[PDB]
Amino acid sequence: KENTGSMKKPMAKAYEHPYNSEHHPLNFSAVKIAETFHDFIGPEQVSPHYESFA
Amino acid sequence: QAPGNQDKILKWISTLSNKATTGESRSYCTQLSSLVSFYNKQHVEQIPTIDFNEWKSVISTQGLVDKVKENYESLIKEQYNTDAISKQISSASSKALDDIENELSFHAAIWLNAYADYTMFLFELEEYNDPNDYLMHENFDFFRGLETELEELTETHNYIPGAKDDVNLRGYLATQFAWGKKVISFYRHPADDFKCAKATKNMLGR
Amino acid sequence: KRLLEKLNTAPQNLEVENILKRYHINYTQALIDELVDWKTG
Amino acid sequence: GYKIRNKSIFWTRAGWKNNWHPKNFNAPRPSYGEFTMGIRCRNDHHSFLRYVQTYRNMSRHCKQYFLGDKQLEETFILGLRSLFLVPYDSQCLTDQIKHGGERRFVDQLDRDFELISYNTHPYQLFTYTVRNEHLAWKNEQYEKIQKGEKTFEQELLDYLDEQVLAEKAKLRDGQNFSIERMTEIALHVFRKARAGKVRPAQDVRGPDGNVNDFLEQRRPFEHPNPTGVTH
Amino acid sequence: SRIINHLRGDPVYQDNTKDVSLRGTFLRGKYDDLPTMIFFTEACDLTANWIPFFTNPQYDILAHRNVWLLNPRNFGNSDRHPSFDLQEMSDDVMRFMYSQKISMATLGGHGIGGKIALAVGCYHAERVTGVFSIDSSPMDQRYHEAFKEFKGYVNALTEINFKTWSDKDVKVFLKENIKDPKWRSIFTNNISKNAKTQSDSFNFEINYLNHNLNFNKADSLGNWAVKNGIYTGRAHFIFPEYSRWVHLATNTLPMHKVCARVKGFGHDIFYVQGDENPLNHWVYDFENYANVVASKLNKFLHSYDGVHALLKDRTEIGNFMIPDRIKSRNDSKHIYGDYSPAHLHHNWRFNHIYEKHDELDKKLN
Amino acid sequence: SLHEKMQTDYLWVKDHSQADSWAKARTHGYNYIAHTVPNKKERYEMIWRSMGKSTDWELEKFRLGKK
Amino acid sequence: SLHEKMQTDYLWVKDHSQADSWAKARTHGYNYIAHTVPNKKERYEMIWRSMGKSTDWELEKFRLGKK
Ligand SMILES: CCCCCCCCCCCCCCCCCC(=O)OC[C@H](COP(=O)([O-])OCC(O)COP(=O)([O-])OC[C@@H](COC(=O)CCCCCCCCCCCCCCCCC)OC(=O)CCCCCCCCCCCCCCCCC)OC(=O)CCCCCCCCCCCCCCCCC
Ligand SMILES: CCCCCCCCCCCCCCCCCC(=O)OC[C@H](COP(=O)([O-])OCC(O)COP(=O)([O-])OC[C@@H](COC(=O)CCCCCCCCCCCCCCCCC)OC(=O)CCCCCCCCCCCCCCCCC)OC(=O)CCCCCCCCCCCCCCCCC
Ligand SMILES: CCCCCCCCCCCCCCCCCC(=O)OC[C@H](COP(=O)([O-])OCC[N+](C)(C)C)OC(=O)CCCCCCCCCCCCCCCCC
């Protein structure tokens, strides 16, 4: 009886906000500022060497 | 058959009774235990064998010893039909019992959902190690939802740290040695002002 | 309680040593003490 | 693991763990009619009905963008109640708050509804994003079922049902297949399955202490110049 | 018999981490009054294996100190508790020292035991004279291959069910699942049959231990947390030249990072000359490794342990004067100058040697 | 019990007779701190532990007392 | 992920030299030595070990070979 199980068609999509995006989020937080800050200073400049540069 | 066949039945009833705390439940356990002991009572009396030839020879009324034997043997043939009963008890039973069959089944599904929550959390927690080794915006992604709440504090101008947290533990750690040791009041907004003022017969509102 | 509180507070060594002598094996008092304790255990 | 060792961590000048009426010099004092000429106060007795109307608006104004998704309306209701039950179940004695907690929470909820009326509240946007990510995965399953194909979730359910038979077919000495055993069977399958996927590195450190990032390429140097595109 | 005295008791599962008692073997010294040494064996490793090391006339360690071969919680005969917090396990030792009337002791350890020993000096330094660590370092070893194997073996041991499994089923399980000979032998001897042959079990708590290792987080024994702090006293480290646990390249820096008085290689840190062999961790088995460890141990106990920091050796006691910081004494009419720091008797609290000698001093005058 | 038993014991917590005459460090280490050493965080932990033993881990006495 | 390789190469530089591809020229650590670190002597010992493993502890080969 369980093997006879079927599925219902779900909704196609929810509401899509026309003024909110991932790169231009509508609301503000230090999280997005941190994302842009690290894009600016770039990744941790890892030295592959055996000794420091100085 | 006689020995060891009731050991398991005693462990079940014992646990069911131990879980009983209210007097009402304890009473039902007594009724339940009686029926089990009633059904599981063992009968051993050494059913004696009848030697009709012995009684037939020593003394008996003509036709009596034989009439008793033939009639006695006829009833001995009759026996219980265990098959028919075995089916009815297994097919359906006590539609009232179906009430708790579906109650305990939903009750278990509730606490199986919680068991899966705690189980899956400890599963995902395996890949998360050393919070001090992750960047800020990456930790918030592991704890999805904090950035959303942080935006709520910002957009409502609740920029007093720990105002909406019931236990602002971070606020107690910073005030361990502060003058006028105090933490922000619950849900305090930096814009609300409940100040009052009154004029009395005396000066300064006194 | 009082009596309970009060209760709360060589030859075998030679036998084993001679055996170790016959096999001319190095022997130490610690080993002998353990074997002696092993016999009593 | 680690517990706060300072026994006076939750001490305040007002008492233990007091975040409802902090001690301040200008403390509340009573007023006497016979001696009071005039007064300027903003307190009132309108918070109860404002608490009611605020719930009705936040619910009815957020449902405008659910598109009749009944499961979302019910999930949102449970989440909306969690926001209004904060003063009823908190450790904070919301009834002893300095100048009236009732007026305080109501005014705080009104600021939330203001954003909800414009459809700019983060909980709204969080809801739309979370739901779209959910429906996309339910539609992916529906398209695979209509094609007669088996879903990744069913392949595990079927693979787990047989693994249980194999374990209890050999577990004859005992017959108590605990939930703990059932659990570690699935986890052994989840770890194996998750490791099979090409997922981004989540843990800082791999089997070695070294970090699993693209930056953890140290000596020795064995990579040549980068090559260009092929035509 | 006399030299070897191990108190006998039964492990007790404890809900409170403070009601934990430690049990182990005591080795009496040759001489009447000697300071005491508390030594922690490797995890899941037997205390008896170290007896021939501490009872060897060639080394003659007992001539210096009385030795307590002590088992940590969840190990051996000591009480059982799921937590392995080094602060909690360190308080356990302080209660043992109190119950046994030990004012202060010399601490030692092998491998993970060395961490436990050093942790006690970090949390209770005023009552620890020195630390002697063997093939260990105050470092996170969770990702060392040697630790993973130990972490892996303990997990395999959780599969065995003594009730159903037979004696032969166990022996076959160990040989195949445990490749290292020594670990295999260690685990076999840890198996014991309780009274009335009810069933066989491991002397150490396999459940509490596996969770600590398998979880692989800060509370793990392989981990060394910043919470443990710094050890202020004398510390000497000895490890093999080629050791899987302590690599000479970088695993020596944690010693300087955690131990303030460690001078460096050749003074407080030594390596034993040896070949590459995974069994070199067990120095007590190989005479070459042991002879060097013993000599360095006797030197630490004789000249360096329980000596004030600013003094070089025990030779300087009574002839080297330490500078004094100004405004450090309560007396106002005190002419500040150099002084020789006070070194006290090893068990001055639980004896009256000071009260006795004060009387004898008066008789002279 | 054994934990509290030894805490109360005068012998277990007793300064030696000459302890008063000895030179006493009158700081926990918060006056001059090492800021750039790799064991920096480990140093702070020993300051916190020293401040706690002085107050039986009731740091309110430190907040009220004189620094 | 999908755009990981393309993005990671866009953010940072890799070392293009293949200096270590040549075996014998690999350094044992005697070219740039740390002189003041507290593990100074442990570093020299590892340099000595690498020089010995390369010659089966017959350092006459190193003296005759090219540095
Ligand atoms: C016509 C021809 C003219 C052009 C010729 C072309 C060539 C010109 C030269 C260009 C050179 C480019 C390549 C070298 C640049 C970096 C050199 C360097 O030492 O950095 C390595 C060093 C670490 O390298 P590492 O060995 O791999 O160690 C990594 C650890 O993470 C490090 O952290 P750690 O804590 O773990 O380890 C210790 C750390 C210790 O170091 C540190 O952690 C911090 C060092 C202090 C940073 C400076 C703070 C100054 C505050 C701002 C004030 C000045 C701003 C400048 C502008 C002011 C207005 C004019 O680093 C060290 O190992 C030793 C430090 C070596 C000295 C550091 C100070 C160098 C001077 C930097 C400031 C220069 C401007 C002021 C000079 C006077 C201006 C006239 O990084 C830095 O020092 C960063 C500071 C900024 C460096 C770039 C600044 C501009 C270029 C500076 C050239 C220096 C010489 C000239 C000035 C010296 C005058 C006394
Ligand atoms: C027999 C003596 C010949 C001396 C010739 C005159 C001076 C050198 C001219 C050539 C320049 C290159 C020098 C390479 C050898 C380095 C020797 C050295 O510096 O001593 C290191 C040595 C210890 O340091 P080391 O690291 O163990 O030495 C190993 C090397 O570092 C590295 O170890 P390795 O095993 O890998 O290398 C072995 C060594 C083996 O060397 C030999 O076996 C010598 C071969 C016979 C001699 C060939 C050179 C003859 C020059 C005469 C013709 C000169 C014409 C000039 C004008 C007219 C002159 C009248 O070097 C070579 O293999 C040479 C191969 C050249 C490869 C060429 C590849 C193509 C490159 C093309 C571009 C070239 C641009 C170069 C830039 C300009 C150069 C500055 O010190 C001593 O031996 C002490 C005892 C004195 C040795 C006898 C004197 C020999 C000259 C050394 C200076 C003595 C100063 C004494 C005072 C000390 C301070 C108070
Ligand atoms: C650094 C660059 C930027 C700097 C920006 C300025 C940052 C200032 C940092 C915060 C300073 C906060 C000072 C608050 C002092 C309160 C102390 C206290 O609670 O009293 C407890 C005290 C002491 O109790 P206690 O328990 O808290 O401390 C005890 C102290 N010992 C340990 C010594 C015993 O008791 C009182 O209640 C007396 C209250 C007197 C309050 C007098 C201060 C009034 C000044 C604040 C008003 C200023 C408003 C300015 C607005 C200007 C607008 C234009």
Does the CB of E85 have a partner CB in chain D at under 8 Å?
yes
Long-range contacts of D81-88 (CB under 8 A, 24+ apart): D83/D109, D83/D112, D84/D51, D84/D55, D84/D109, D86/B166, D86/B187
Q: F52–D11: do the CB atoms touch at under 8 Å?
A: no
Q: Which residue, among E10, E9, E14, E21, has the nearest Cα to E96 in the 3D structure?
A: E21
| DSSP one-letter string for chain B | --SSSSHHHHHHHHHHHHT--SHHHHHHHHHHHHHHHHHT-------PPP-HHHHHHH---TTHHHHHHHHHHHHHH----HHHHHHHHHH---TTHHHHHHHHHHHHHHHHHHHHHHHHHHHHTTT---GGGS-HHHHHHHTTTHHHHHHHHHHTT--STTSS-SS-HHHHHHTTT-TT---PPTT--TT-----EEEESSGGG-
Residue D190 in tokens: 């989840």
Count of beta carbons in the 10 Å neighbourhood of residue D193: 13
Q: What residues pair up with D15 in beta bridges, in sequence order?
A: D12
Task: Show residues of chain F in contact with E230, CB under 8 Å.
Answer: 39, 42-43, 45-46
Q: Which residue, among E129, E230, E234, has the nearest Cα to F49 in the 3D structure?
A: E230
- List phi, psi (to 5°) of D39: -150, 150
Question: What single-letter DSSP state applies at residue E21?
Answer: -
Q: Which residue, among D36, D33, D40, has the nearest Cα to B201 in the 3D structure?
A: D36
B194 ligand 3 Cβ < 6 A: no
Count of beta carbons in the 10 Å neighbourhood of residue E285: 14
Question: What single-letter DSSP state applies at residue E161?
Answer: -
- For the CA of B180, the nearest atom of ligand 3: 27
For residue A42, CA distances in Å to A45, A46, A54, G11 come to 8, 11, 21, 7
Q: Which residue, among F2, F7, F22, F16, has the nearest Cα to E351 in the 3D structure?
A: F16
- For the CA of F36, the nearest atom of ligand 1: 35
**Alpha-carbon gap, residue E183 to E176, rounded angstroms:** 13
Question: What single-letter DSSP state applies at residue E72?
Answer: P
Residue E195 CB burial class (10 angstroms; 0-12, 13-18, ≥19): exposed
- Do the chains E and D touch each other, judged by at least 3 C-beta pairs below 8 angstroms? yes
Q: Which residue, among E104, E225, B173, E229, has the nearest Cα to F28 in the 3D structure?
A: E229
- List phi, psi (to 5°) of E89: -65, -25
D13 ligand 3 Cβ < 6 A: yes
Q: Which residue, among E64, E121, E137, E125, has the nearest Cα to E300 in the 3D structure?
A: E64
**Alpha-carbon gap, residue B197 to B117, rounded angstroms:** 53
For residue D12, the chain F residue with the least C-alpha distance is F60
Three-state DSSP state, E131: strand
Contact present, D108 and B187 (Cβ < 8 Å): yes
Question: What single-letter DSSP state applies at residue E132?
Answer: E
**Alpha-carbon gap, residue E204 to B32, rounded angstroms:** 44
Biggest distance spanned by C-alpha atoms of chain B = 133
Distance in Å, CA D28 to ligand 2 centroid: 93
Q: Which residue, among E58, E77, E102, E68, has the nearest Cα to E290 in the 3D structure?
A: E58
Q: Which residue, among E95, E96, E98, E120, has the nearest Cα to E107 in the 3D structure?
A: E120
G5 ligand 2 Cβ < 6 A: no
Q: G41–E264: do the CB atoms touch at under 8 Å?
A: yes
Per the listing, tokens 């800050």 go with A37
Q: Which residue, among E150, E218, E210, E201, has the nearest Cα to E178 in the 3D structure?
A: E150
For residue D218, the chain G residue with the least C-alpha distance is G15
Angle at E268 between CA E265 and CA E272, to 5 degrees: 65
Pairing of strands D15-16, E24-27: unpaired
- For the CA of G65, the nearest atom of ligand 2: 35
| DSSP one-letter string for E315-329 | GGTTT--B---TT-S
Pairing of strands D36-40, B197-200: antiparallel
Please give, rounded to a whole number of angstroms, the shortest distance from the CA of E94 to a CA of chain D: 19
Q: Is D45 annotated as a binding residue?
A: yes
F64 ligand 3 Cβ < 6 A: yes
Query: What single-letter amino acid sits at E288?
Result: N
- List phi, psi (to 5°) of D170: -105, -15
Count of beta carbons in the 10 Å neighbourhood of residue D77: 13
Q: Is D43 annotated as a binding residue?
A: yes
Please report the resolution in angstroms. Answer: 2.7
Does the CB of F57 have a partner CB in chain D at under 8 Å?
yes
Residue D201 in tokens: 């590195």
G24 ligand 2 Cβ < 6 A: no
Three-state DSSP state, D86: helix
Residue D62 in tokens: 């957020």
Per the listing, tokens 């100190």 go with E65
Task: Show residues of chain G in contact with E264, CB under 8 Å.
Answer: 38-41
Q: What contacts D199, CB < 8 A, 6 or more positions away?
A: G1
Q: What contacts E50, CB < 8 A, 6 or more positions away?
A: E39, E41, E69, E110, E284
Question: What single-letter DSSP state applies at residue E46?
Answer: -
Per the listing, tokens 């202020």 go with E232
**Alpha-carbon gap, residue E225 to B159, rounded angstroms:** 34
Query: What single-letter amino acid sits at E202?
Result: F
Please give, rounded to a whole number of angstroms, the shortest distance from the CA of B75 to a CA of chain D: 42
Q: What contacts E198, CB < 8 A, 6 or more positions away?
A: none
Contact present, E242 and E259 (Cβ < 8 Å): no
Residue B205 CB burial class (10 angstroms; 0-12, 13-18, ≥19): middle
Question: What single-letter DSSP state applies at residue D147?
Answer: T
Per the listing, tokens 């639980």 go with E350
Q: Which residue, among E101, E271, D114, has the nearest Cα to F6 in the 3D structure?
A: E101
Residue E313 in tokens: 């050796």
**Alpha-carbon gap, residue A16 to D131, rounded angstroms:** 10
Biggest distance spanned by C-alpha atoms of chain A = 74
- Output the CA torsion E42→E47→E53→E54 (10° steps): 120
Contact present, E74 and E88 (Cβ < 8 Å): no
Report the structure determination method. Answer: cryo-EM
Task: Show residues of chain A in contact with B144, CB under 8 Å.
Answer: none
Q: What residues pair up with E132 in beta bridges, in sequence order?
A: E108, E236
- List phi, psi (to 5°) of E269: -130, 125
Pairing of strands E24-27, E4-6: antiparallel
Count of beta carbons in the 10 Å neighbourhood of residue G7: 12
Number of helices (H), then strands (E), belonging to chain F: the values are 3, 0
Q: What residues pair up with E259 in beta bridges, in sequence order?
A: E231
Long-range contacts of C32-36 (CB under 8 A, 24+ apart): C33/E1, C33/E2, C33/E3, C33/E4, C34/E4, C34/E51, C36/C12, C36/E1
Q: D14–B115: do the CB atoms touch at under 8 Å?
A: no
Asked if the peptide bond before residue E138 counts as cis, ω within 30 degrees of 0, the response is no
